[PDB]
Coordinates of C-alpha atoms and ligand atoms in Angstrom, one line a residue:
Chain R
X544 CA 156.4 76.0 84.2
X545 CA 159.8 77.6 84.9
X546 CA 159.0 80.8 82.9
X547 CA 155.5 80.9 84.5
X548 CA 157.0 80.8 88.0
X549 CA 159.7 83.4 87.1
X550 CA 157.2 85.9 85.8
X551 CA 154.7 85.5 88.6
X552 CA 154.5 87.2 91.9
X553 CA 156.2 85.4 94.8
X554 CA 154.2 82.5 96.3
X555 CA 154.7 84.1 99.8
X556 CA 152.7 87.2 98.7
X557 CA 149.5 85.4 97.7
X558 CA 146.1 86.7 98.9
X559 CA 142.5 86.1 98.1
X560 CA 141.1 88.5 95.5
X561 CA 137.7 88.3 93.9
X562 CA 136.5 89.7 90.6
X563 CA 132.9 90.3 89.4
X564 CA 132.1 88.2 86.3
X565 CA 129.6 90.9 85.2
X566 CA 131.6 94.1 85.0
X567 CA 135.2 93.0 85.8
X568 CA 135.7 95.2 88.9
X569 CA 137.7 93.8 91.9
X570 CA 135.1 93.0 94.5
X571 CA 135.2 94.8 97.8
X572 CA 134.9 93.1 101.2
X573 CA 132.5 94.8 103.6
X574 CA 132.0 93.3 107.0
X575 CA 133.5 90.1 105.8
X576 CA 131.1 89.8 102.8
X577 CA 132.4 90.0 99.2
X578 CA 130.3 92.5 97.2
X579 CA 130.4 94.3 93.9
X580 CA 129.5 97.9 94.7
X581 CA 128.7 98.9 91.1
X582 CA 126.5 95.9 90.4
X583 CA 124.8 96.0 93.8
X584 CA 123.9 99.6 93.3
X585 CA 122.1 98.4 90.1
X586 CA 120.2 95.6 92.0
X587 CA 122.1 92.7 90.5
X588 CA 123.5 89.4 92.0
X589 CA 126.5 88.5 89.8
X590 CA 129.0 85.7 90.4
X591 CA 132.3 86.6 92.2
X592 CA 135.3 84.4 91.3
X593 CA 138.8 84.1 92.7
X594 CA 141.8 85.1 90.5
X595 CA 145.6 84.6 90.9
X596 CA 147.3 87.3 88.9
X597 CA 150.1 89.9 89.4
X598 CA 149.6 93.3 91.0
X599 CA 150.9 95.1 87.9
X600 CA 148.1 93.4 85.8
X601 CA 145.5 94.8 88.2
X602 CA 147.1 98.3 88.0
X603 CA 147.2 98.1 84.1
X604 CA 143.6 97.1 83.9
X605 CA 142.4 99.7 86.4
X606 CA 144.2 102.4 84.4
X607 CA 142.6 101.1 81.2
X608 CA 139.2 101.4 83.0
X609 CA 140.1 105.0 83.9
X610 CA 140.6 105.7 80.2
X611 CA 137.1 104.4 79.6
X612 CA 137.8 100.8 78.3
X613 CA 135.8 98.1 80.1
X614 CA 137.5 94.7 80.3
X615 CA 135.4 91.6 81.1
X616 CA 136.7 88.1 81.9
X617 CA 135.0 84.8 81.4
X618 CA 135.9 81.4 83.0
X619 CA 136.0 77.9 81.7
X620 CA 133.5 75.4 83.0
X621 CA 134.4 72.3 81.0
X622 CA 132.2 69.3 81.7
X623 CA 133.8 66.6 83.8
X624 CA 135.9 63.9 82.1
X625 CA 136.4 60.2 82.9
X626 CA 139.4 57.9 82.2
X627 CA 138.8 54.9 80.1
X628 CA 141.1 51.8 79.6
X629 CA 142.9 51.7 76.2
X630 CA 144.1 48.8 74.2
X631 CA 147.8 48.2 73.9
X632 CA 150.0 49.4 71.0
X633 CA 153.5 48.2 70.2
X634 CA 154.9 50.5 67.5
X635 CA 157.9 48.3 66.8
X636 CA 158.7 47.1 63.2
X637 CA 158.4 43.6 61.9
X638 CA 161.9 42.1 61.9
Chain W
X292 CA 145.9 91.7 21.5
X293 CA 149.0 92.0 19.4
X294 CA 151.3 89.8 17.3
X295 CA 153.5 88.7 20.3
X296 CA 151.2 88.0 23.3
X297 CA 149.2 85.5 21.2
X298 CA 152.3 83.4 21.0
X299 CA 152.4 83.4 24.8
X300 CA 148.7 82.7 25.1
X301 CA 149.0 79.7 22.7
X302 CA 151.0 77.8 25.4
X303 CA 148.3 78.4 28.1
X304 CA 145.8 77.1 25.5
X305 CA 147.6 73.7 25.5
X306 CA 147.4 73.2 29.2
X307 CA 143.7 74.0 28.9
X308 CA 143.4 71.4 26.2
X309 CA 145.2 68.9 28.4
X310 CA 142.8 69.6 31.2
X311 CA 139.9 69.2 28.8
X312 CA 141.2 65.8 27.9
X313 CA 141.9 64.6 31.5
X314 CA 140.7 66.7 34.5
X315 CA 143.2 65.1 36.9
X316 CA 146.4 65.5 34.9
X317 CA 149.5 67.1 36.4
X318 CA 150.2 70.5 34.8
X319 CA 153.7 71.9 34.2
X320 CA 156.1 72.9 31.4
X321 CA 156.7 69.4 30.2
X322 CA 153.1 69.0 29.0
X323 CA 154.0 71.2 26.1
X324 CA 156.2 68.4 24.7
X325 CA 153.0 66.6 23.6
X326 CA 151.4 69.3 21.5
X327 CA 151.9 71.5 18.5
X328 CA 150.4 74.9 17.7
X329 CA 149.5 77.0 14.7
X330 CA 148.7 80.7 14.8
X331 CA 146.9 83.0 12.4
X332 CA 146.9 86.6 13.6
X333 CA 144.4 89.3 12.8
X334 CA 143.5 92.5 14.6
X335 CA 139.9 91.4 14.9
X336 CA 140.0 87.6 15.5
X337 CA 143.1 85.4 16.0
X338 CA 142.9 81.7 15.3
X339 CA 145.0 79.2 17.3
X340 CA 145.0 75.5 16.4
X341 CA 146.3 73.0 19.0
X342 CA 147.2 69.5 17.9
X343 CA 147.9 66.4 20.0
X344 CA 150.9 64.6 18.5
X345 CA 150.0 61.0 19.2
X346 CA 146.2 61.3 18.6
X347 CA 146.4 64.0 15.9
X348 CA 143.2 65.5 17.4
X349 CA 142.6 69.2 16.8
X350 CA 141.2 72.0 18.9
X351 CA 140.5 75.5 17.6
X352 CA 140.4 78.7 19.7
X353 CA 139.2 82.1 18.6
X354 CA 140.7 85.0 20.4
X355 CA 139.1 88.5 20.5
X356 CA 139.7 91.8 22.2
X357 CA 137.3 92.7 25.0
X358 CA 135.8 95.7 23.1
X359 CA 134.7 93.8 20.0
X360 CA 133.4 90.2 20.3
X361 CA 131.9 88.5 17.3
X362 CA 131.9 84.8 18.1
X363 CA 130.4 82.0 15.9
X364 CA 131.5 78.4 16.5
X365 CA 133.5 76.6 13.8
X366 CA 134.6 73.0 13.2
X367 CA 136.4 71.5 16.2
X368 CA 135.8 74.6 18.2
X369 CA 136.7 74.7 21.9
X370 CA 133.1 75.8 22.4
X371 CA 133.8 79.2 24.1
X372 CA 135.6 82.4 23.1
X373 CA 138.9 83.5 24.5
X374 CA 138.9 87.1 25.7
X375 CA 141.9 89.4 26.4
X376 CA 140.8 92.1 29.0
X377 CA 142.4 95.3 30.2
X378 CA 142.1 94.4 33.9
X379 CA 141.8 91.2 35.9
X380 CA 138.3 89.8 35.9
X381 CA 136.5 86.6 37.0
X382 CA 136.1 84.0 34.3
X383 CA 138.2 81.0 33.1
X384 CA 138.3 82.3 29.5
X385 CA 139.3 85.9 30.3
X386 CA 143.0 86.8 30.5
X387 CA 144.4 90.3 31.3
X388 CA 147.2 91.9 29.4
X389 CA 149.1 91.9 32.7
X390 CA 149.4 88.1 32.4
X391 CA 150.9 88.3 28.8
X392 CA 153.8 90.8 29.0
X393 CA 156.2 87.8 29.0
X394 CA 156.2 84.1 28.1
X395 CA 154.7 83.0 31.3
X396 CA 154.4 79.2 30.9
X397 CA 158.1 78.5 30.4
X398 CA 159.5 80.6 33.2
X399 CA 161.2 78.9 36.0
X400 CA 158.7 80.5 38.4
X401 CA 155.7 78.8 36.7
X402 CA 154.2 76.3 39.2
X403 CA 153.5 72.6 39.0
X404 CA 150.0 71.7 40.2
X405 CA 147.1 69.3 40.0
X406 CA 143.5 68.8 41.1
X407 CA 142.7 66.3 43.8
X408 CA 140.1 63.6 43.2
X409 CA 137.5 62.5 45.7
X410 CA 139.6 59.9 47.5
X411 CA 142.6 62.3 47.9
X412 CA 140.2 65.0 49.1
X413 CA 138.8 62.6 51.8
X414 CA 142.3 61.7 52.9
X415 CA 143.3 65.4 53.2
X416 CA 140.1 66.2 55.2
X417 CA 140.8 63.3 57.5
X418 CA 144.4 64.3 58.1
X419 CA 143.3 67.9 59.1
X420 CA 141.1 66.8 62.0
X421 CA 142.6 67.4 65.4
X422 CA 141.1 64.3 67.0
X423 CA 139.1 66.3 69.5
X424 CA 135.5 66.1 68.4
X425 CA 135.1 67.8 65.0
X426 CA 137.7 70.6 65.3
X427 CA 140.0 70.8 62.3
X428 CA 143.0 72.7 60.9
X429 CA 142.8 75.0 57.8
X430 CA 144.9 75.1 54.7
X431 CA 146.6 78.3 53.5
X432 CA 144.5 80.3 51.0
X433 CA 144.7 81.4 47.4
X434 CA 142.4 83.7 45.3
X435 CA 140.0 82.4 42.7
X436 CA 141.4 84.8 40.1
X437 CA 144.9 83.3 39.8
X438 CA 146.0 81.8 36.5
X439 CA 146.3 78.4 38.1
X440 CA 142.6 78.4 38.8
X441 CA 141.8 79.6 35.3
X442 CA 143.8 76.7 33.8
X443 CA 142.1 74.1 36.1
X444 CA 138.4 74.8 35.3
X445 CA 135.7 72.3 34.5
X446 CA 132.0 73.3 34.3
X447 CA 130.7 70.4 36.5
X448 CA 133.5 69.9 39.0
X449 CA 133.9 72.6 41.7
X450 CA 137.5 73.3 42.7
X451 CA 138.2 73.6 46.4
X452 CA 141.8 72.4 46.9
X453 CA 144.9 72.6 44.7
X454 CA 148.0 70.6 45.3
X455 CA 151.4 72.0 44.5
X456 CA 154.7 70.2 43.9
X457 CA 157.2 72.7 45.2
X458 CA 160.9 72.7 44.2
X459 CA 162.9 71.8 47.3
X460 CA 166.7 72.2 47.4
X461 CA 167.3 69.4 49.9
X462 CA 164.6 66.8 49.1
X463 CA 163.9 67.6 45.4
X464 CA 160.1 67.9 45.5
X465 CA 157.8 68.7 48.4
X466 CA 154.0 68.4 48.5
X467 CA 151.8 71.3 49.7
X468 CA 148.1 72.2 49.5
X469 CA 146.0 75.3 49.2
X470 CA 142.3 76.1 49.5
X471 CA 140.5 78.4 47.0
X472 CA 138.5 81.3 48.3
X473 CA 135.9 83.2 46.2
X474 CA 136.2 86.8 45.0
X475 CA 133.3 89.2 45.1
Chain N
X534 CA 149.3 83.8 78.9
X535 CA 152.0 85.9 80.4
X536 CA 149.6 88.8 81.1
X537 CA 147.3 86.5 83.1
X538 CA 150.0 84.3 84.7
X539 CA 149.0 81.2 82.8
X540 CA 151.3 78.4 81.6
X541 CA 152.1 78.9 77.9
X542 CA 151.1 76.2 75.3
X543 CA 154.8 75.3 74.7
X544 CA 156.9 72.3 75.6
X545 CA 155.6 70.7 78.8
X546 CA 152.8 73.2 78.7
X547 CA 151.5 71.9 75.4
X548 CA 149.4 69.2 77.3
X549 CA 146.8 69.3 80.1
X550 CA 147.3 67.3 83.2
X551 CA 144.7 65.5 85.5
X552 CA 144.9 63.3 88.6
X553 CA 143.0 60.0 88.8
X554 CA 141.8 59.5 92.4
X555 CA 140.3 56.1 91.7
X556 CA 143.1 54.0 93.3
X557 CA 143.4 56.3 96.3
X558 CA 139.7 55.9 97.1
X559 CA 139.9 52.1 96.8
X560 CA 142.4 51.9 99.8
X561 CA 141.0 51.5 103.3
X562 CA 142.8 52.4 106.5
Chain E
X775 CA 139.1 55.6 53.8
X776 CA 138.6 58.1 56.6
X777 CA 138.5 55.4 59.2
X778 CA 141.8 54.0 58.1
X779 CA 143.5 57.4 58.4
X780 CA 141.8 57.8 61.8
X781 CA 143.2 54.5 63.0
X782 CA 146.7 55.3 61.8
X783 CA 146.5 58.7 63.7
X784 CA 145.3 57.0 66.9
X785 CA 148.3 54.6 66.7
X786 CA 150.6 57.6 66.1
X787 CA 149.3 59.2 69.3
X788 CA 151.0 56.5 71.4
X789 CA 154.6 57.6 70.8
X790 CA 156.4 59.4 73.7
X791 CA 159.0 62.2 73.9
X792 CA 160.9 64.0 76.6
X793 CA 158.4 66.8 77.0
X794 CA 155.5 64.4 78.1
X795 CA 157.5 62.3 80.5
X796 CA 159.1 65.4 82.0
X797 CA 155.7 67.0 82.5
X798 CA 154.3 63.8 84.1
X799 CA 157.3 63.6 86.5
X800 CA 157.0 67.3 87.4
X801 CA 153.3 67.1 88.3
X802 CA 153.8 63.9 90.4
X803 CA 156.9 65.3 92.1
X804 CA 155.1 68.6 93.0
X805 CA 152.2 66.7 94.5
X806 CA 154.4 64.4 96.5
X807 CA 156.6 67.2 97.8
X808 CA 153.5 69.1 99.0
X809 CA 152.2 66.1 100.9
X810 CA 150.2 63.5 99.0
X811 CA 150.2 59.9 99.9
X812 CA 152.6 57.6 98.0
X813 CA 150.9 54.7 96.1
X814 CA 153.7 52.1 96.2
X815 CA 153.1 48.5 97.2
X816 CA 154.3 47.3 100.6
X817 CA 153.8 50.8 101.9
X818 CA 155.2 51.1 105.5
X819 CA 157.3 53.3 107.7
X820 CA 160.4 52.2 105.8
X821 CA 159.0 53.9 102.7
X822 CA 159.5 57.3 104.2
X823 CA 163.3 56.7 104.6
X824 CA 163.8 56.4 100.8
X825 CA 164.5 59.0 98.1
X826 CA 161.4 60.6 96.7
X827 CA 162.6 60.3 93.1
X828 CA 163.0 56.6 93.7
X829 CA 159.4 56.4 94.9
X830 CA 158.2 58.3 91.8
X831 CA 160.1 56.0 89.4
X832 CA 158.7 52.9 91.3
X833 CA 155.2 54.2 91.0
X834 CA 155.6 54.7 87.3
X835 CA 157.1 51.3 86.7
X836 CA 154.6 49.3 88.7
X837 CA 151.6 51.0 87.1
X838 CA 150.2 53.1 90.0
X839 CA 151.1 56.6 88.7
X840 CA 148.0 58.7 89.3
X841 CA 148.7 61.4 86.6
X842 CA 146.7 61.5 83.4
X843 CA 147.6 63.4 80.3
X844 CA 145.4 64.7 77.4
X845 CA 147.3 64.6 74.1
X846 CA 145.1 64.3 70.9
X847 CA 141.6 64.4 72.3
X848 CA 142.3 61.3 74.4
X849 CA 143.2 60.7 78.1
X850 CA 146.3 58.5 78.6
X851 CA 148.0 57.2 81.7
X852 CA 151.7 56.8 81.7
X853 CA 151.4 53.1 80.8
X854 CA 149.3 53.7 77.7
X855 CA 152.4 55.0 75.8
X856 CA 154.7 52.7 73.9
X857 CA 156.7 50.7 76.4
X858 CA 160.1 50.8 74.7
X859 CA 160.0 54.6 74.3
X860 CA 159.2 55.0 78.0
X861 CA 162.2 52.8 78.9
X862 CA 164.4 54.7 76.5
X863 CA 163.6 58.1 78.0
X864 CA 163.7 56.9 81.6
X865 CA 167.2 55.3 81.1
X866 CA 168.5 58.6 79.8
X867 CA 166.9 60.6 82.6
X868 CA 168.3 58.3 85.3
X869 CA 171.8 58.6 83.9
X870 CA 171.8 62.3 84.0
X871 CA 170.2 62.4 87.4
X872 CA 173.0 60.2 88.7
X873 CA 175.5 62.6 87.3
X874 CA 173.7 65.4 89.3
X875 CA 173.7 63.4 92.6
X876 CA 169.9 63.3 92.7
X877 CA 169.3 59.6 92.3
Chain G
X1185 CA 108.9 76.3 97.7
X1186 CA 111.7 73.9 96.9
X1187 CA 112.8 71.3 94.5
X1188 CA 115.4 68.5 94.1
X1189 CA 118.0 68.1 91.4
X1190 CA 121.1 66.0 90.5
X1191 CA 124.3 67.9 89.6
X1192 CA 128.0 68.4 90.2
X1193 CA 129.5 70.8 92.7
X1194 CA 133.0 72.0 92.1
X1195 CA 135.5 72.1 95.0
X1196 CA 139.2 72.8 95.5
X1197 CA 141.7 70.6 97.5
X1198 CA 145.3 71.0 98.5
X1199 CA 147.9 68.2 98.1
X1200 CA 148.1 67.4 101.8
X1201 CA 144.4 66.4 101.7
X1202 CA 145.0 63.7 99.1
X1203 CA 145.4 61.0 101.8
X1204 CA 143.4 58.2 103.3
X1205 CA 141.0 60.8 104.7
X1206 CA 140.0 61.9 101.2
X1207 CA 136.2 61.4 101.5
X1208 CA 136.0 63.3 104.8
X1209 CA 137.9 66.2 103.3
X1210 CA 135.7 66.2 100.2
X1211 CA 132.6 66.3 102.3
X1212 CA 133.9 69.0 104.6
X1213 CA 134.8 71.2 101.7
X1214 CA 131.5 70.7 99.9
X1215 CA 129.5 71.6 103.1
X1216 CA 131.7 74.6 103.8
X1217 CA 131.3 76.0 100.3
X1218 CA 127.7 75.2 99.6
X1219 CA 125.7 74.2 102.7
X1220 CA 123.8 77.3 103.7
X1221 CA 125.0 79.8 101.1
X1222 CA 122.6 81.7 98.7
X1223 CA 123.9 81.6 95.2
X1224 CA 122.1 82.8 92.1
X1225 CA 119.0 83.6 94.2
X1226 CA 118.6 80.1 95.6
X1227 CA 119.9 78.1 98.6
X1228 CA 120.8 74.4 98.9
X1229 CA 119.3 73.3 102.2
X1230 CA 120.4 69.6 101.8
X1231 CA 123.3 68.0 100.0
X1232 CA 123.7 64.3 99.4
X1233 CA 127.0 62.8 98.1
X1234 CA 126.2 60.0 95.7
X1235 CA 129.0 57.5 96.8
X1236 CA 127.7 55.1 94.1
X1237 CA 128.9 56.7 90.8
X1238 CA 132.4 57.1 89.3
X1239 CA 134.2 60.2 90.5
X1240 CA 135.5 62.3 87.5
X1241 CA 139.2 63.1 87.1
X1242 CA 140.5 66.0 89.1
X1243 CA 142.1 69.0 87.2
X1244 CA 145.5 70.2 88.4
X1245 CA 145.7 74.0 88.6
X1246 CA 149.0 75.5 89.8
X1247 CA 149.4 73.8 93.3
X1248 CA 145.8 72.7 93.8
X1249 CA 143.3 70.2 92.5
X1250 CA 139.7 70.8 91.3
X1251 CA 137.1 68.1 91.7
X1252 CA 133.5 67.8 90.5
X1253 CA 131.5 65.9 93.2
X1254 CA 128.2 64.5 92.0
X1255 CA 125.4 65.2 94.4
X1256 CA 121.6 65.4 94.9
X1257 CA 120.7 68.9 96.0
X1258 CA 117.5 70.1 97.7
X1259 CA 117.2 73.7 96.6
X1260 CA 115.0 76.0 98.6
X1261 CA 114.1 79.7 97.9
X1262 CA 111.6 82.4 98.7
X1263 CA 109.8 85.1 96.8
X1264 CA 107.7 88.2 97.4
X1265 CA 104.4 87.7 99.3
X1266 CA 105.4 84.8 101.5
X1267 CA 104.5 85.0 105.2
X1268 CA 107.1 84.1 107.8
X1269 CA 107.5 84.4 111.6
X1270 CA 110.7 85.0 113.5
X1271 CA 112.3 86.4 116.6
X1272 CA 112.8 90.2 116.7
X1273 CA 116.3 91.5 117.3
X1274 CA 117.4 95.1 117.9
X1275 CA 121.0 96.1 118.0
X1276 CA 120.9 99.9 117.7
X1277 CA 118.5 102.7 116.9
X1278 CA 118.7 102.0 113.1
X1279 CA 119.2 98.2 112.8
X1280 CA 116.2 96.1 113.6
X1281 CA 115.9 92.6 112.1
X1282 CA 113.8 89.4 112.4
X1283 CA 115.8 86.1 112.7
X1284 CA 114.2 82.9 111.4
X1285 CA 115.4 79.4 110.9
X1286 CA 117.1 80.2 107.6
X1287 CA 115.7 83.7 106.8
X1288 CA 116.5 87.3 107.8
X1289 CA 113.9 90.0 107.5
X1290 CA 115.0 93.7 107.5
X1291 CA 112.5 96.4 108.6
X1292 CA 112.4 99.8 106.9
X1293 CA 113.1 102.9 109.0
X1294 CA 109.7 104.4 108.3
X1295 CA 107.9 101.5 109.9
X1296 CA 108.2 102.0 113.7
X1297 CA 110.6 103.3 116.4
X1298 CA 113.2 102.0 118.8
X1299 CA 113.2 103.0 122.5
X1300 CA 114.2 101.7 125.9
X1301 CA 115.2 97.5 123.4
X1302 CA 111.6 97.7 122.3
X1303 CA 109.8 98.2 119.0
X1304 CA 106.5 100.2 118.5
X1305 CA 104.8 99.4 115.2
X1306 CA 101.4 100.0 116.7
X1307 CA 102.1 97.3 119.2
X1308 CA 104.8 96.8 121.8
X1309 CA 107.4 94.2 120.9
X1310 CA 110.1 93.2 123.3
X1311 CA 113.7 92.5 122.1
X1312 CA 113.5 88.8 121.2
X1313 CA 109.7 88.7 120.8
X1314 CA 108.2 86.6 118.0
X1315 CA 106.6 88.6 115.1
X1316 CA 105.1 87.8 111.7
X1317 CA 106.3 89.5 108.6
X1318 CA 105.8 89.4 104.8
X1319 CA 108.7 89.6 102.3
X1320 CA 108.6 92.6 100.0
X1321 CA 112.0 93.0 98.3
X1322 CA 115.1 90.9 97.7
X1323 CA 118.7 91.7 98.4
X1324 CA 122.1 89.9 98.8
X1325 CA 122.3 87.3 101.5
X1326 CA 124.8 87.6 104.4
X1327 CA 126.4 85.0 106.7
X1328 CA 124.6 82.1 105.1
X1329 CA 121.1 83.4 105.3
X1330 CA 118.4 84.9 103.1
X1331 CA 117.9 88.7 103.4
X1332 CA 114.7 90.4 102.4
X1333 CA 113.1 93.8 103.0
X1334 CA 109.8 93.0 104.7
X1335 CA 107.0 94.6 106.6
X1336 CA 105.4 93.3 109.8
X1337 CA 102.0 91.7 109.2
Ligands
ZN1732 ZN1 130.1 94.0 89.0

């Protein structure tokens, strides 16, 4: 946790940023509505998801896009989990 | 084949005899203390007789060059010819000249190894599971063409895992395992 | 993990943490 | 023979080290600092005059710590670990915290 | 034109909301993030919180908690060809729309004219008049409402 907090951007500089799960572009906000211009122009309705990353990461990815490399991110949707009682274990030796 | 490398091959054809007698025996230099060998050299066919000291049972191996093979079984034959090849090839009875430049079996670098039985294999497979569903870890790999695999061969027992008893400077001996991967 | 600002799978980060709200929801004002 | 090995490994899962208890305390402390409700017995206005680390330790000891940890494909609460190991690590932690003027 | 399903909705809570008012905060968040919003071409017109099943464990992510709330969802949607009726609304010379209970119909430019507002699609329609339309093409919804390119019936 310590190294994670050291390498991140300051908590006071957070803001809401949305990414398109289809093409990886950062979604624009027009008239208060989040929209992917590229995918909208192609008549698609992809999912937009919030991310919490550094500014330098966004710059690096955008430059890679400028060089022609497309970077697409997926997200984890693990099914819900439930806690169950467990039987007791001692672990001491027999003396 | 020449008059020297046959003497080196005779020692490998004592570990193979031991494995023929018992497929789960531990293989290393010390096995040689239980056998004697007789060699009759010839440029066309070499004859190697392996004899078990306590039982006095004989096994006869016929050794040919790759180019000219003229094999006919004799009394107490191993049942298959031994072939010396120019380059490494698949087959438990084919040995390249590269393996026979030196007396391989008695070198300090020769391993100590064994084949696992069904119970030990089940235990190993159980230990590798991560406990999260059916995910599992994987052992390090070794090629099917190593001399260890050639020595541990049986027609009706596939070989998937090999256990090694490593020399260890602080604990004496350490146990490790490898998985065998095929060669095309 | 560093590139995307995630917690590395090292030390305290080797495990995953959840919160069980069962006891909180069984309390009544 | 596989079931016996599985049972042995499930028992092995219950031992506790510094990393796990430190992570549990860190999560609980972050949540409490940012404003969750403490789950101690006899909760009252006198509870807010205590030290937060005292509250966290009390929650752990009386079995009302809300944090759950996933270790070897299982979900464990702090009280599912071996009791003696938890006492061992908590004693050490409390000593060094007292040296730091935290506890 | 609708169906009913059982499923989980994912929501995010802050630590200061893990108090005695936990159920109220969960309900408010669920309604705020799913009540009248069109997602994947469908809307959820009614959401029921089970209140009779075990709540799953919440996942801690940085400084927040993620919770899967079980619910019964009444999904509603529309397709091409449906006939609807709604109040006309003119804001400028280019933007003319029809507002319905939960649907917005957009009229193409090459359909009528705006003068004064009033609309002339072969008949005189006063700003705020009720008109019938038929959906033709789909788009992305805005401010919790369906959007469809439609022509006046
Ligand atoms: Zn897109």
